[PDB]
Amino acid sequence: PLFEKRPKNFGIGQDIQPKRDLTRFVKWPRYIRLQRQRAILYKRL
RNA sequence: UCGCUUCUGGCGCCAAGCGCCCGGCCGCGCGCCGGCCGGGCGCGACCCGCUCCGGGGACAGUGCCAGGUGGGGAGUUUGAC
Ligand SMILES: [Mg+2]
Numbered sequence A: 001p002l003f004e005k006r007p008k009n010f011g012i013g014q015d016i017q018p019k020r021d022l023t024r025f026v027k028w029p030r031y032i033r034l035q036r037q038r039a040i041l042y043k044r045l
Numbered sequence B: 001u002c003g004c005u006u007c008u009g010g011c012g013c014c015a016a017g018c019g020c021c022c023g024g025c026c027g028c029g030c031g032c033c034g035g036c037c038g039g040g041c042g043c044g045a046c047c048c049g050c051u052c053c054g055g056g057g058a059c060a061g062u063g064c065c066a067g068g069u070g071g072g073g074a075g076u077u078u079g080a081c
């Protein structure tokens, strides 16, 4: 009777975006960057 | 094309709405059910993946030598009768 949906729109310019996983874009520290690049060189070279 | 917002000196969030399931405390007892109370993949809010996004790039640039220029600067000299 009173219970209603009232949804959101995660467009552009419209309502604020939610919290999703941002693991790929973190500013990782030094000891982590270094080893990952170290492994990649064993595939490039 | 794209996560869809252009007539106006407005508002916009914190866990949203719900949507499917698991659980506890009281009446049912067939308990993973009815009153108070919670978790959950996260459904909504698609998956997978090896460099944060772009721009350059085996040249710039750094080290050591070789040659030219170089009163900006340094040292000095600028006869005797
Ligand atoms: Mg001089």
Ligand SMILES: [Mg+2]
Pocket (backbone or CB within 6 Å): none
């Ligand atoms: Mg002198």
